[PDB]
């Protein structure tokens, strides 16, 4: 059964005219002295409370005047206009009271809308606040999303003031969870200690429970006499209690200490011919190849960046339009390090193909990437805000470059092309001319190690290496990588284990590709054989694959089943 | 991979014989594969595609016609799409489509199986006219769910066949032909239509024997069948497949007994004459008229690669049938039985001997093709001796294998 | 202003409808002869622009939970309420009058506009006077004028409908005093007025003194007074005195309906301005003048023409996208009002009128049909298309005519007669010559198939069922004549144009005799008034009004 939409919108707009022109008002909402002349039945179309207020037979049913309390005038007015005309102007501030009043009036649709907005809005500075809000109001889906995101960014920050004012059950659920992301198990210990010492003896009864969730490796060492110092005087029911209490609860390592420096690969050669490409990863320590989730909607021709906070982002790319068929989309995604899935984020303003994603000062910079515009400013460089979840344009690059790479050194953006280089100064939003290379090479990658830029390879590629020093502002040659002759090595500049290594795949004539990595000696200017990748674990990846530095959990990921 | 140059194609008759999306596809193929005539073909294609409110393929054809017109403005040294068409067509199509959708969904609240099936069939037809293949497939599937009678099943099969022909999902076409044939107890001739659909689907899938057999059963009483394939092209397809696959006696039996391909060859006298010359050992005229039919049907919707393979098979079979009645045939006379030269005929005969099924020897001295009739006994004794030598050799090998096992011999 | 309705306006509509149908939150209920309608106050005023005072004015109505609204039908109010709640009107063809009355009892511009458009589009053959009186009762000025013209034409056509008797005095005065009467004689309106006046008593005799003076004085000195002598009430003296005064004065002038000159409607002529491709013109056999007509779509061509016995012009199909639209020519407004479109997009359809039904035979329906040989007819009364028995054989460039209330279609060599009563085709005689690209004319009881590829004259008789030759049209050699056979002035004649090499086209019509088998020279169309027409032009016979149309300017 379909519905006519023309008279539908005519209905809705004439209803709007009646809301603005006060005519059919038998019931009025009296809120803090503010008159709200409205209907009982549009309030029906919105809310599921007034059915108790009107269709009941109570004193309020007959009362043509109702004194609605514990509500806000602005929230009530916006809910009323949401019922009457259909414009839910949701900002970034009044969503809290909007959800409060939606739960008050039990309005399902606006509840879902604001829940979706809060799911989109979850970030660092409001993670604990939103988790407390979802604990106050039962919002289980938002509660779980909070719990996860809060766990991550709280283990990251653990310094927000809203953490001190939290319920005991929420803290027990957070600390006892196996999803915490911490390099050590001592930071959660001191976080719990400072939470307990934040208040008076009201935390004493919760101390017998918070320690029951932490491992016993810290329940006999230091931070036991510190509580004794803070113990209430002459209390002999706690010191002796804790003396003989830490026998049970099965000491076990957490999951956050399972991050290893791994080489994340994208757009690898798909094992099954049914799919175009796939994503894999190499383990320099485990010597295995763990599989990764496919790019969102098989997003090909994308770029990767990993922030110092160890977060993976994807920008740009093209999707095959619904034989050659591909359309470029400016969608943006974020990778979940535990759930093994790509969470969508705020898309860009312009579509990109192979964009150079660089992180600096918490901002994600996408330089170039074959924009759709092609106007006089054919660079379309734009940064991303990780706290406001929005994109802001930056100073354009003076010269248009193609197939370029960019790195970050000394809090500055260093984008490199065939022969030119320009440094971006984020504090003043300007570009300054840099040193000029003496060799014309392209289709290469660079890795930022310390205060130097290492442009490895260029044109297949070659073994040419030009080292640039930021403090010296000069390009100098060091050596050439010793590789087998009559081959086409695929060089990949990368930084791992506080050293400059290379991921070079070489292919001989009438032979399969061979994987081997080398360690470049910074002081000796020589590439040393660090490890040889056996072909029994790693298969062919292709040519348009990218590599990046990052840490991943082997427990959450699964080993890729594939024959050697 | 394709596209050749050839004049004398009659655009008007070939366009008028077909109708529907099949006509659009055939006109597009003719325009794309036949240069020096792409202008008028594209003009007629855009004139007919504007009918029945097409959207995307209309844009493609308009762009192609604009490119062709721009090309015409430089050789003897682009039309407007009238974008108001977009507005009016989109408005009318949306209005009628939403009205029909409202009617069908209201009928869904009334819960009548036959009414739902008919409404979904109408929606599929409207989507096919609009240029929405997947939408039409989904509508016809929601119709296939609500079937009530045998005629409803037949209509569902016909609609699915028609859609999957455009989608090139010929597996669905064959499955639905089998469903519509085997189920209802295998004046109104529906089996003829089903056999025509099966034959065209098989030919599109690079099949020649079963396709010819299915086409042979098609009666001419069907007459009008423009949504899938014209009767003249049906006759051409059947004749070519029969010539390529059916040998002489099979050819005669099938053509005579069918009594509908008699009429079909009456529509296409060239194929009839070619088959008659094939039977009567007149392969020179047969093959020259075959080359004529080549240049004539090299730009056909579903023929070109298939017909090239068919013609290769036809010439091979013609050579095989020609040499068969001879034990000592002069290669001069065999070459004179076609427009080919002596060297090309010799190369073709050598290739046929290498492949087989000609059993011949080429006496290139006097250029005489001698058939090979070897005594069975001489071959039998030779291969029997080879078998005994192989049996003894394998007897040695197995005898050797017992040595390493009885004496436990292996790599440590 | 931002008024986005994506996936929300429909959702809020659904909330409205769901919480209405559940009898939720109710505060007002409409009592309609005992039927209760609990519904939104706001929806009540959103539809009805009157309710906005029913629950806002500070009268006792505001503080009243139960309001007893009368003089409204329960079904109409319920359909109005559900149309307010879901947006679907779903108006039928029977309850339009009461629905419009109830909508006016609310005075808005939504449902009222919808029903006004529906009523304007639904004036088919009979309800014209009824809905004209309806619009006289409820002010519907646009529909009032449309019904005025339509009632003029149709009442002049039938002038026996019973609904016409019950009409107001002012409406009758407006109808009869107008100069838009489609009558070829002045006495039919006189007798219509006589029968209207003799229908009732003294109350209508009061209106007699005002309606008798609206007719031309030629009919007021007639036997009318002799009939009033026996029909006048006794002891009436001043009535005769005032009746005698209506002979000399009040501007006796000729009417407009007498100008039904039998003319020829042509389509797809050689346009004068190069910006236009084709044009529709007309020719006057008697006035020897060339008139023009407005193109119905102004951009679409390749249309077919048909003329009903009531002298009506219709246009169907045409292309170059093919559109199944339908149009009708106005005999006074010189415009084209569209009608119900066909279900299939035809190219050059052949429309035939029989038994008051329009039959479209062939003309490239879809071409890709399972049966390419199909036909479809039209209903001039119900305004709908009804599928009929399909054609026997697939034909192209065919012609069809109607003889003795039977459908006859002609092709290259075959002919089939369609029996309308049983909806079947019957085999007819076979022609000995195979000629196409020609048309046929239905003159009397004989079909005259002229031309084909020439000058072939093959006469067929229904009563005899045989084809025979008569003669060859006298035409200059080395030419390709374009023959056009049509009935003029109850006499068979032809309209042919000859074209030679390096020569100009000449237009000339000839008078043909049945027993003489000769085309006598009737009239030669001079090129000083008529210019070249073309090749794809069509000819048909019909009556037109010179005043409504305009002369086509062209230099001799």
Listing DSSP states for C181-223 in one string gives ---SSSHHHHHHHHHHHTTS-HHHHHHHHHHGGGS-TTTTSST
Q: Which of B278, B307, B272, B306 is nearest to B291 (CA)?
A: B307
Q: How large is the angle between the packed helices C96-104 and C74-86, nearest 10 degrees?
A: 80
Q: In terms of CA atoms, which chain A residue is nearest residue B105?
A: A1
DSSP secondary structure string, C403-460?
ETTEEEEE-SS-EEEEETTTTEEEE-PPPSS---S-EEEEETTEEEEE------EEEE
Show residues of chain B in contact with A3, CB under 8 Å.
Answer: 102
> Rounded distance, CA B96 to CA B106, Å?
15
Phi, psi of A548 (to 5 degrees): -150, 165
Helical spans, DSSP H, in B50-83 = 56-72
Question: If residue B382 lies in a helix (H) or strand (E), which one and from where to where?
Answer: helix B376-406
Phi, psi of B147 (to 5 degrees): -95, 150
> Rounded distance, CA A356 to CA A456, Å?
16
Phi, psi of A442 (to 5 degrees): -140, 180
Structure tokens, B320? 């095989």
User: In which order are the strands placed within the sheet that holds B360-363?
Assistant: B328-330, B368-371, B360-363
Could you give the count of Cα atoms lying within 13 Å of B197 in the half-sphere of its Cβ?
Answer: 31
Buried b (16+ CB within 10 A) or exposed e, A125-137: ebbbbbbbbbbee
Cα C237 to chain centroid, rounded? 47
In sequence order, the 6+-apart residues with CB closer than 8 A to the CB of C45 are A18, A23, A24, C51, C52, C54, C55
In which residue are the tokens 């390096």 written? C502
Please count the helices (runs of H) and the strands (runs of E) in chain A: 14, 29
To the nearest whole Å, the CA of B193 is away from the closest chain C CA by: 10
Paired sense of beta strands C28-32 and C66-68, if any? parallel
Q: Is A389 left (phi over 0), alpha (psi -120 to 50) or beta?
A: left
Could you give the count of Cα atoms lying within 13 Å of C204 in the half-sphere of its Cβ?
Answer: 16
Question: Strand, helix or coil at A482?
Answer: coil
Structure tokens, C119? 């009523």
Helical spans, DSSP H, in A158-180 = 168-176
Paired sense of beta strands C290-293 and A312-315, if any? unpaired
Q: Are C281 and C552 in contact (CB under 8 A)?
A: yes
Q: Are B144 and B156 in contact (CB under 8 A)?
A: yes
> Rounded distance, CA C368 to CA B51, Å?
13
Q: In terms of CA atoms, which chain C residue is nearest residue B20?
A: C368
Q: Is C46 left (phi over 0), alpha (psi -120 to 50) or beta?
A: alpha
CB atoms within 10 A of CB C262: 16
CA dihedral sign of residues B260, B262, B266, B267? positive
Query: For the CA atoms of A111, A115, A116, A122, what is the dihedral angle to 10 degrees?
Result: 160
In which residue are the tokens 């106007």 written? A375
> Rounded distance, CA C170 to CA C531, Å?
49
Contact assignment for C4 to A43 by CB distance below 8 Å: no
CB atoms within 10 A of CB C503: 11
Q: How large is the angle between the packed helices B209-216 and B231-245, nearest 10 degrees?
A: 130
CA dihedral sign of residues B107, B109, B114, B120? positive
Q: Which of C20, C39, C17 is nearest to C87 (CA)?
A: C17
Structure tokens, A75? 């929230």
Strands (E), C271-398: 278-283, 290-293, 304-307, 313-316, 326-329, 336-339, 350-354, 357-361, 375-379, 384-387
Q: In terms of CA atoms, which chain C residue is nearest residue A51?
A: C25
In sequence order, the 6+-apart residues with CB closer than 8 A to the CB of C522 are C493, C509, C510, C511
Q: How large is the angle between the packed helices B231-245 and B191-204, nearest 10 degrees?
A: 60
Show residues of chain A in contact with B109, CB under 8 Å.
Answer: 1
Please count the helices (runs of H) and the strands (runs of E) in chain C: 13, 28
Could you give the count of Cα atoms lying within 13 Å of A61 in the half-sphere of its Cβ?
Answer: 13
Q: Which of C310, C343, C309 is nearest to C326 (CA)?
A: C343
Paired sense of beta strands C415-419 and C424-427, if any? antiparallel
Could you give the count of Cα atoms lying within 13 Å of A122 in the half-sphere of its Cβ?
Answer: 27
DSSP annotation of A324 reads -
Show residues of chain C in contact with B18, CB under 8 Å.
Answer: 368
In which residue are the tokens 């734009």 written? A382
Paired sense of beta strands B360-363 and A277-282, if any? unpaired
Q: In terms of CA atoms, which chain C residue is nearest residue B15?
A: C367
Helical spans, DSSP H, in B73-206 = 84-108, 113-130, 133-145, 150-167, 170-182, 191-204
CB atoms within 10 A of CB C126: 13
Please count the helices (runs of H) and the strands (runs of E) in chain B: 20, 3
CB atoms within 10 A of CB C526: 12
Decide: residue A456, CB within 10 A, 0-12 exposed, 13-18 middle, 19+ buried.
buried
Q: Are A448 and A407 in contact (CB under 8 A)?
A: yes
What was the experiment behind these coordinates?
A: cryo-EM
Structure tokens, B300? 């056909």
Q: What chains are in contact with C, requiring at least 3 Cβ pairs below 8 Å?
A: A, B
CA angle A532, A534, A538 (to 5 degrees): 120
Paired sense of beta strands A27-31 and A34-38, if any? antiparallel
DSSP secondary structure string, C90-131?
---SSTHHHHHHHHHTT--SSHHHHHHHHHHHT--SSTHHHH
Phi, psi of C250 (to 5 degrees): 65, 55
Please give the C-alpha separations between residue C64 and each of C24, C68, C105, in angstroms, as whole numbers: 18, 10, 21
CB atoms within 10 A of CB A359: 20
Question: Strand, helix or coil at B348?
Answer: helix
Q: Are C249 and C508 in contact (CB under 8 A)?
A: no
> Rounded distance, CA A328 to CA A472, Å?
40
CB atoms within 10 A of CB C15: 18
DSSP secondary structure string, A487-516?
---B--EEEETTEEEEEEEEE-TTS-EEEE
Structure tokens, C468? 């025979």
User: In which order are the strands placed within the sheet that holds C28-32?
Assistant: C35-39, C28-32, C66-68
Decide: residue B274, CB within 10 A, 0-12 exposed, 13-18 middle, 19+ buried.
buried
In which residue are the tokens 């050799």 written? B393
Q: What is the largest CA-CA distance in chain A?
A: 95
Q: Are B230 and B17 in contact (CB under 8 A)?
A: yes
Structure tokens, C221? 């000195």
Structure tokens, A279? 């994503």
> Rounded distance, CA B392 to CA B399, Å?
10
**Which are the residues after which chain C is interrupted (C to N > 2.5 Å)?**
319, 453
> Rounded distance, CA A453 to CA A95, Å?
46
Could you give the count of Cα atoms lying within 13 Å of C508 in the half-sphere of its Cβ?
Answer: 16
Structure tokens, C507? 């237009």
Expressed in angstroms, the distance from the first to the final Cα of chain A is: 57
Q: What chains are in contact with A, requiring at least 3 Cβ pairs below 8 Å?
A: B, C
Q: Which of A140, A139, A170, A174 is nearest to A155 (CA)?
A: A174
Please give the C-alpha separations between residue C75 and each of C90, C91, C111, C117, C503, in angstroms, as whole numbers: 13, 12, 15, 21, 73
Contact assignment for A7 to C41 by CB distance below 8 Å: no
Q: Are A19 and A84 in contact (CB under 8 A)?
A: yes
Q: Are B165 and B201 in contact (CB under 8 A)?
A: yes
Question: Strand, helix or coil at B377?
Answer: helix
Cα B407 to chain centroid, rounded? 65
Contact assignment for C345 to B47 by CB distance below 8 Å: no
CA angle B345, B349, B239 (to 5 degrees): 85
Q: Are C512 and C523 in contact (CB under 8 A)?
A: no
Q: Are A344 and A321 in contact (CB under 8 A)?
A: no
Please give the C-alpha separations between residue A540 and each of A272, A285, A485, A506, in angstroms, as whole numbers: 13, 20, 20, 11
> Rounded distance, CA A118 to CA A95, Å?
8
Structure tokens, A35? 């008159």
To the nearest whole Å, the CA of A11 is away from the closest chain C CA by: 7
Q: In terms of CA atoms, which chain C residue is nearest residue B221?
A: C371
Show residues of chain A in contact with C15, CB under 8 Å.
Answer: 44-46, 109
User: Which residues pair with residue A292 across a beta bridge?
Assistant: none
User: Which residues pair with residue A474 across a beta bridge?
Assistant: A469
> How many residues does the structure list for chain C?
556
> Rounded distance, CA A79 to CA A76, Å?
5
Structure tokens, C233? 């009430």
Q: Are A74 and A113 in contact (CB under 8 A)?
A: no
Which of C13, C26, C85 should be substituted to probe chain A, the one whose Cβ sees the most A Cβ atoms within 10 Å? Answer: C13
């Amino acid at each position: 059964r379909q519905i006519n939409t023309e008279y539908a919108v005519s209905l809705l707009e004439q209803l709007k005219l009646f809301y603005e022109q006060q005519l059919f008002t038998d019931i009025v909402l009296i809120v803090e002295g503010t008159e709200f002349p409205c209907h009982k039945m549009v309030l029906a179309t919105c809310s599921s409370y007034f059915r108790a207020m009107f269709m009941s037979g109570l004193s309020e049913s007959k009362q043509t005047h109702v004194h609605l309390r514990n509500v806000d005038a602005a929230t009530l007015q916006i809910i009323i206009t949401y019922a009457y005309t259909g414009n839910l102007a949701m900002n970034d501030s009044t969503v809290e009271q909007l959800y409060e009043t939606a739960c008050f009036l039990q309005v399902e649709d606006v509840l879902q809308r604001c829940r979706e907005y809060l799911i989109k809005k979850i970030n660092a500075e409001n993670c604990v606040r939103l988790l407390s809000f979802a604990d106050l109001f039962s919002c289980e889906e938002l509660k779980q999303s909070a719990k996860r995101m809060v766990e991550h960014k709280f283990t990251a920050v653990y310094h927000q003031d809203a953490f001190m004012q939290l319920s005991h059950d929420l803290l027990i659920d957070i600390l006892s969870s196996d999803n915490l992301n911490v390099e050590k198990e001592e930071t959660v210990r001191e976080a719990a200690m400072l939470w307990l010492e934040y208040n008076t003896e009201s935390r004493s009864q919760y101390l017998s429970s918070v320690l029951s969730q932490i491992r016993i490796d810290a329940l006999s060492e230091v931070t036991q006499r510190a509580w004794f110092q803070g113990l209430p005087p002459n209390d002999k029911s706690v010191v002796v209690q804790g003396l003989y209490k830490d026998m049970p609860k099965f000491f076990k390592p957490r999951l956050g200490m399972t991050k290893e420096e791994m080489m994340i690969f994208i757009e690898a050669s798909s094992e099954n011919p049914c799919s175009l490409y796939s994503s894999v990863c190499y383990s320099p320590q485990a010597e295995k190849v763990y599989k990764l989730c496919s790019p969102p909607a098989d997003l090909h021709k994308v770029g990767t960046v990993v922030t110092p906070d160890n977060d993976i982002y994807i920008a740009g790319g093209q999707v095959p339009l619904k034989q050659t068929a591909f359309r470029t989309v400016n969608c943006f995604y974020w990778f979940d390090a535990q759930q093994n899935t790509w969470f969508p984020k705020t898309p860009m303003l312009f579509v990109r193909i192979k964009p150079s994603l660089v992180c600096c000062e918490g901002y994600i910079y996408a330089i170039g990437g074959d924009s759709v515009g092609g106007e006089l400013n054919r660079r379309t460089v734009e940064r991303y805000d990780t706290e406001k979840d929005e994109w802001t344009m930056v100073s354009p690059l003076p010269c248009a470059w193609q197939w370029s790479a960019a790195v970050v050194v000394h809090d500055c953006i260093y984008v490199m092309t065939l022969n030119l280089m320009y440094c971006y100064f984020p504090r003043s939003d300007s570009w300054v001319e840099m040193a000029m290379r003496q060799t014309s090479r392209s289709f290469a990658s660079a890795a930022a190690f310390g205060d130097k830029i290492f442009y490895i390879g260029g044109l297949g590629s070659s073994v040419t290496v030009e080292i640039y020093d930021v403090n010296k502002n000069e390009w100098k040659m060091a050596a050439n990588i010793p590789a087998k002759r009559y081959s086409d090595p695929c060089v990949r500049a990368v930084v791992i284990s506080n050293s400059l290594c290379v991921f070079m795949r070489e292919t001989h004539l009438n032979e399969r590709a061979k994987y081997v990595t080398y360690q470049y000696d910074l002081e000796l200017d020589r590439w040393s054989l660090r490890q040889h990748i056996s072909e029994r674990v790693l298969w062919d990846l292709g040519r348009d694959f990218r590599c990046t530095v990052g840490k991943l959990y082997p427990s959450c990921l699964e080993e890729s089943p594939w024959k050697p | 991979n394709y596209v050749v140059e050839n004049p004398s194609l009659d655009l008007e008759q070939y366009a008028a014989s077909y109708s529907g999306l099949m006509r659009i596809e055939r006109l597009q193929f003719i325009a794309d594969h036949c240069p020096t005539l792409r202008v008028e073909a594209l003009k007629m294609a855009l004139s007919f595609v504007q009918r029945t409110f097409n959207v995307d393929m209309y844009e493609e054809i308009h762009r192609k016609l604009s490119e062709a017109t721009r090309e015409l403005q430089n050789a003897p040294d682009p039309p407007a799409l009238d974008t108001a068409w977009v507005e009016a067509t989109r408005k009318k199509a949306l209005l009628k489509l939403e009205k029909l959708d409202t009617d069908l969904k209201n009928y869904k609240g009334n819960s009548i199986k036959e009414s739902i099936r008919r409404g979904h069939d109408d929606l599929g037809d409207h989507y096919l006219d609009c240029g929405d293949l997947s939408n039409a497939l989904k509508c016809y599937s929601r119709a296939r769910d609500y079937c009530t009678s045998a005629k409803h099943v037949i209509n569902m099969c016909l609609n699915v066949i028609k859609v999957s022909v455009y989608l090139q999902n010929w597996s669905h076409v064959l499955s639905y032909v089998s469903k519509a044939e085997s189920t209802p107890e295998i004046t109104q001739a529906i089996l003829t239509k089903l056999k025509c659909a099966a034959g065209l689907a098989e030919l599109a899938a690079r099949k020649y024997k079963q396709a010819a057999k299915c086409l042979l059963l098609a009666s001419f009483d069907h007459c009008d069948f423009p949504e899938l394939l014209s009767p003249s092209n049906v006759a051409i397809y059947g004749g070519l497949c029969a010539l390529a696959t059916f040998d002489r006696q099979e050819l005669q039996r099938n053509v005579i007994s069918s009594s509908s391909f008699k009429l079909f060859l009456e529509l296409e006298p060239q194929v009839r004459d070619i088959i008659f010359k094939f039977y009567e050992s007149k392969y020179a005229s047969c093959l020259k008229m075959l080359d004529e039919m080549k240049d004539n049907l090299l730009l056909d919707m579903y023929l070109a690669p298939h017909v090239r393979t068919l013609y290769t098979q036809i010439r091979n079979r013609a050579l095989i049938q020609y040499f068969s009645p001879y034990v000592s045939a002069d290669m001069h006379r065999m070459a004179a039985a076609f427009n080919t030269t002596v060297a090309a005929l010799e190369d073709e005969l050598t290739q046929l001997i290498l492949e087989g099924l000609i059993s011949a020897r080429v006496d290139s001295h006097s250029k005489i093709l001698y058939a090979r009739d070897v005594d069975q006994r001489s071959t039998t004794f030779e291969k029997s001796l080879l078998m005994g030598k192989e049996f003894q050799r394998r007897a040695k090998a197995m005898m050797l294998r017992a040595a390493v096992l009885r004496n436990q011999i292996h790599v440590k």
